[PDB]
Structures are given as structure tokens and as C-alpha cells.
Amino acid sequence: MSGFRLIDIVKPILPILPEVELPFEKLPFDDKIVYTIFAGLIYLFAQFPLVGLPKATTPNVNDPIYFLRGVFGCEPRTLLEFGLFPNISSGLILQLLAGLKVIKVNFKIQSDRELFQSLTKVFAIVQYVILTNIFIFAGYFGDDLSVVQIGLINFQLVGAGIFTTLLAEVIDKGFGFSSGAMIINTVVIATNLVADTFGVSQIKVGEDDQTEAQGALINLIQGLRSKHKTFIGGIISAFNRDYLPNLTTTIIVLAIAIIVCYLQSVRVELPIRSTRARGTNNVYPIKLLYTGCLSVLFSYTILFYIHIFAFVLIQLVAKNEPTHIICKIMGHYENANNLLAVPTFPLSLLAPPTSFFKGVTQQPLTFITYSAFILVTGIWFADKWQAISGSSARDVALEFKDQGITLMGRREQNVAKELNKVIPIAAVTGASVLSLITVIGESLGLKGKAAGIVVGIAGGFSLLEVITIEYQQSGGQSALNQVLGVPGAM
């Protein structure tokens, strides 16, 4: 309708769909653990295929995409092929607008804090419907059709994706434990790990990528060791060969795991004084990599989005034949002369070069530009994180200061200006160094999750460090049972 009124709001059509809204009842502790595992069991049905019989039969859908898979929190050829990717993206867009300071919002006011969050989950669903048209424009399914079943497949993916945003919400509002974005990220990087390493093997031949060999851990170690129920034996150590070494994926997951799990155990210690004494007191480490967790999640996400230089939105224009203002000048995703064919020359040097293989030493130039971009994007989203509240550096230092000085009388003062110098050096550069060791974690090998696994565990033990501090110091269910007991008063 039109009539005559001054509007530009989409307001009658908005309730006529049937999107979703969110809980309703919750209970702890037993109920929370049962419901959070239940949410991950609905996710666990990623083994069922999506509707579409001509794509499902002869082409079996085109080759698996081991690059989108981890940050999305997806799996190809299933209900949940988009995962968190549009939900996080709506967060990138509004992080960008409020962090460029084009749209200024003060987030410690109630009214426009709630507006931001509600707008994010509406724009998640708007992002979902444009993404579902984006994926069929990519030519993933191996059938691009006119309006028939290509409309129905895109509808289903949004409908199962409005479910996965509802799960992200449900866990977050306290139905389950943790945050629901954190959980779906961690169980997808988890699926990939034992599918590849423990797996199972099956005898077939196939020109296209088929899962003939999975179970690298079993094949390598039991071949090295002895003979089994299976007749095998002999050591396959390493090769550049088309037949996989089996040692290659076993070492690289461990290599990633040790180095970033120790970076995750790097914290910056800032001391506090007197316990009821005279002299020094606690060593209080702060958690750099849970602060930088959402910064480098945003950094990893944006590398797949950008029209100028990325995977998803350049694969469309590579597929799309007409040449105009938008053209495959953005990047050529097509067959190549090369032995292994992936984009021959794109502007996507922001595209990470790793795969379920060995690292690539053959282009150092694309490595330098890739590293440079994600460090720049890491400090870009670092200053947005500070600007858009959180624990704001300006507010918390000022607010604690006046509050404490006049807390009846009087009081003696704080380590929060002592924090004030050292926190910006730790925060901005800790996002940047997290981004630097994200590309190092990728370069060791593996993909389909290589930067998504490093951030997933990195924010996981730094989240664990927060929860252990709240357990032991603040009280309740506690972690002080292991060691504590006897401090002193002078």
C-alpha cells in the first residue's frame, strides 16, 4: 500500500512473516546441561541431506569447500550450510557503522542498547535471505535453474537457518550454558577433527572428491605399529603425493594445538597490592584472547565476504557471465591450467592459501599481503570494540575513580590507572598478535577451520580463566578446593 503518509519503514509486511522470537523458560544446573547438549544433538543431525533430487543424484553436488566451513559453523550438503555466517555478519555491519562513528549510539543507556541487539537479529535474517540467493548464484549445487526447485532449496536453508539463529539465541538467554554462537563454532571444528583423524575408510573409486580415505590416525599409526583385523603394515612418513601421507593431518592438528594453546596460556600479569597488610599482593593476569576472540572472529569472517577481494561474493561474479561494472576482474574462480585448480589469479590475496595438505612456500607475496590485511583488520575491530562500550577504558577508569574517592568520606585508591597504561598495549596488540598467530596456525596446515579452531580454543581457556576466577574469588560453586586455604593478615 501507499496512501499519503510520510513513511519509509517496512512495517505492515514485517509481522506478515513469520520469522521467530525466543525463550521463555530456562532452569539450571541439570536442566542447563541437558538442554545445551540437546541443542548440540539437533545440530548433530548434519548427516541428513537437503532436498533436491537432481543435484543429489548424478553430480552429488560439487566439491567440498574447505575454507567457509569453520567460520560459518556449517557442513556442505545438509540443512545448516550457512550456520552463524549471516548472524555474525549483521554484527560486523553494525560494528562497522557504530565503530566508524557514522551512527553514534551510547550503549550504557537501556533503550538504544536493546535496539542494537534486536536490529542485529532482524538483519541476521535479512542477511540470511540474501545469502541463500548468493549461494545458488555461486553455482555450488551443480544445477543452476530458473524458478522451480532452486527456490525451494533456498527457502529450506533459510528455514533451518532461522532455527540455528534461534538456537544461538536460546543458549545465550540461559536455556543452555555458554553462548550459542560459541557452542556451534566449537562443535563444528570438533566434527571436522575426528571425521578427518579417526574417521572410517571405504573402498570406492572416484574422479571427484569422495571420502575414500578418512581415518588418518588409524591408517598411519596402525600401519606403523603392526597389523590389525585389516591387512596393512609399512610406514608412510611423508610425501608430496596425491595419495595423502596420513602423517600430514595428524601432525598439523597437534602442531596448531600446542602453539596457539600456549598463546592462549599467555596472559599479561598486572599486580595489585596489600591483602590486609603492607607490601605486594596478587599477580592478577588478564585475558587477552577472549577480548580479541570476537575481534578476530570478525576479522576471519570479513575475508570471505568482500566483493572486491574475497571468496563468496567473487564466486558469484565469476559464475555470472555478463561483464559490466561488476565483472570477474574481482577474481577468476574457474578451471585452471595448474595441476590443482582453485582461483588462478584473483584480487583475493586475502584468501588464505592452506588446505588439508602441506603449507605453501611457493608464493611468499600472497602470504605477506594476507598477513598484513588481517593484522590491519585486527586493529580495526580492536578500536571498534573499545569504542562500542564493553568495559570502556574512559568510563571504567573515571567511574571507579570518582565512586571510590567518595564512597563515604573517602577511600584509598586503585590500580586502575596502573591498568590504564598497560591494558591498551595488551588489548590492541593482543588482537593483532592473535591475528598474526592465526595465519601461522593456518600455514602449518589444514583448512575447513584452521583459523576457526585457533580462535575457538583461544577464547575457550580464557573464558575458562574468567569462570575459574568467578568460581574461586567471587564464590558459589568453586575452584579453590584444589589449593587455597591459608592467607594471612598482618
Binding site: 521467530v20 522470537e21 525466543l22 525463550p23 521463555f24 523458560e25 530456562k26 538442554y35 540437546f38 539437533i42 543431525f45 541428513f48 541431506p49 537437503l50 532436498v51 533430487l53 540443512l79 529450506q156 528455514g159 533451518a160 532455527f163 534461534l166 538456537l167 536460546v170 536455556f175
Partner: peptide
């Protein structure tokens, strides 16, 4: 408010619908 039960029911029925087709 919707319900945590409604989302649970919706999804399982969606899974049963999709698998065959």
C-alpha cells in the same frame, strides 16, 4: 515470548520432512 518447546518441536518435524524428499 514463543517457547523453547516450540522451537524444539519445529526443528524435529523439519528434519523428518527434509530427509525423504
Amino acid at each position: 515470548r514463543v517457547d523453547s518447546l516450540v522451537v524444539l518441536f519445529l526443528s524435529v518435524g523439519f528434519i523428518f520432512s527434509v530427509i525423504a524428499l
